[PDB]
């Protein structure tokens, strides 16, 4: 569980996060932003843990651009930038919301404050529901609604979602005890909407899980490439686009998705088109406080 790797990932995540806020100017082509960031991650000796999330407003997460994407940042836009970096499989997951070409807002504040609230509170020994309460309050007591079914999550090596949420609400039977050595993304989301998200198209992001019989030559070969370049970390449709006709690409991906070799990370929309804000730090739990990998 090499911490120095985890830390580097965090430093790099931290840098490119900051650069990403500088480049978040109105008329900034969303495609170009993502490419700029991911480029800068690889310069600093990082590989991306996943395609960079550039989710806007009602859109909560799992938007990354494609080639041909013309989405462009418009002033007043609440832009969630979710950056991920890994060092030989050791992960830094960090996120900020920014009102493009504008000052911070009380909604943006509710989320960032929820993050700090959780981090202060976190020691080894603490039950995760305690961090839940911490977040819930910050967001509510500013008269906002936290997104219930989109949370933080345990991180392990080459395993981005390692299957224990740090939920954004108190739940009596969220009883997990934070351990010396646990890595965890704390992501509060807040919205003026319902406080709940669902899936909508497109599916712009994908993850290898399992190899499976693939009858079709085109799809088998694509699965091979995917495993070689990306393994069991998520990947953008965008990255594969380069080579291979876009039609035969989209079909292969759905053909693999069907067989259950790859699974999609489709876009998530806040269910009442509630404008949504996010702030994420990676933390390593330790005895009487926590490292913050990405601060």
Curated annotation (Swiss-Prot):
Optimum temperature is about 90 degrees Celsius. A divalent metal cation 1 binds at residues 82, 93, 280. InterPro entries: Creatinase/aminopeptidase-like, Met_Aminopeptidase_Type2, MetAP_archaeal, Pept_M24, Pept_M24_MAP, Pept_M24A_MAP2, Pept_M24A_MAP2_BS, WH-like_DNA-bd_sf. The keyword Hydrolase applies. Keywords: Aminopeptidase, Hydrolase, Metal-binding, Protease. It is an enzyme of class 3 (hydrolase). Its cofactor is Co(2+); Zn(2+); Mn(2+); Fe(2+). It comes from the Archaea. PROSITE patterns: MAP_2. One of its GO terms (biological process) is proteolysis. Pfam families: Peptidase_M24. Its EC number is 3.4.11.18. Substrate binds at residues 62, 161. Binds 2 divalent metal cations per subunit. Has a high-affinity and a low affinity metal-binding site. The true nature of the physiological cofactor is under debate. The enzyme is active with cobalt, zinc, manganese or divalent iron ions. Most likely, methionine aminopeptidases function as mononuclear Fe(2+)-metalloproteases under physiological conditions, and the catalytically relevant metal-binding site has been assigned to the histidine-containing high-affinity site. Optimum pH is 7-8. Coiled coil: none annotated. CDD domains: MetAP2. GO terms for molecular function: initiator methionyl aminopeptidase activity; metal ion binding; metalloaminopeptidase activity. GO terms for cellular component: cytoplasm. A divalent metal cation 2 binds at residues 93, 153, 187, 280. Changing residue 161 to A: Reduces enzymatic activity by 96% at 37 degrees Celsius and by 88% at 87 degrees Celsius. Removes the N-terminal methionine from nascent proteins. The N-terminal methionine is often cleaved when the second residue in the primary sequence is small and uncharged (Met-Ala-, Cys, Gly, Pro, Ser, Thr, or Val). Belongs to the peptidase M24A family. Methionine aminopeptidase archaeal type 2 subfamily. This is Methionine aminopeptidase.
């Amino acid at each position: 569980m090499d911490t120095e790797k985890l830390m580097k990932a965090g430093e790099i995540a931290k840098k490119v996060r900051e650069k990403a806020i500088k480049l978040a100017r109105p008329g900034m082509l969303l495609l170009e932003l993502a490419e700029s960031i991911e480029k800068m991650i690889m310069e600093l000796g990082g590989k991306p843990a996943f395609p960079v999330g550039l989710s806007i407003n009602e859109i909560a997460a799992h938007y990354t651009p494609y080639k041909g994407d013309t989405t462009v940042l418009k002033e007043g836009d609440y832009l969630k930038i979710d950056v991920g970096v890994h060092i030989d499989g050791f992960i830094a997951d960090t996120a900020v919301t920014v009102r493009v070409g504008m000052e911070e807002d009380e909604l943006m504040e509710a989320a960032k404050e929820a993050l700090n609230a959780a981090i202060s509170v976190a020691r080894a020994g603490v039950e995760i529901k305690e961090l839940g309460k911490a977040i819930e309050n910050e967001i509510r007591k500013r008269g906002f609604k936290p997104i219930v079914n989109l949370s933080g999550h345990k991180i392990e090596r080459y395993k981005l979602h390692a299957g224990i949420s740090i939920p954004n609400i108190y739940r009596p039977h969220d009883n997990y005890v934070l351990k010396e050595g646990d890595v965890f993304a704390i992501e509060p989301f807040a919205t003026i909407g319902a406080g709940q998200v669902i899936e909508v198209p497109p599916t712009l992001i994908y993850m290898y899980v399992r190899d499976v019989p693939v009858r079709v030559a085109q799809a088998r070969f694509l699965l091979a490439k995917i495993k070689r370049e990306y393994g069991t970390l998520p990947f953008a449709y965008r990255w594969l686009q380069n080579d291979m006709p876009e039609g035969q690409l989209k079909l292969a991906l759905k053909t693999l998705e069907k067989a259950g070799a790859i699974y999609g990370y489709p876009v998530l929309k806040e269910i009442r088109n509630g404008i949504v804000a996010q702030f994420e730090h990676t933390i390593i739990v330790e005895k009487d406080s926590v490292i913050v990998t990405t601060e």
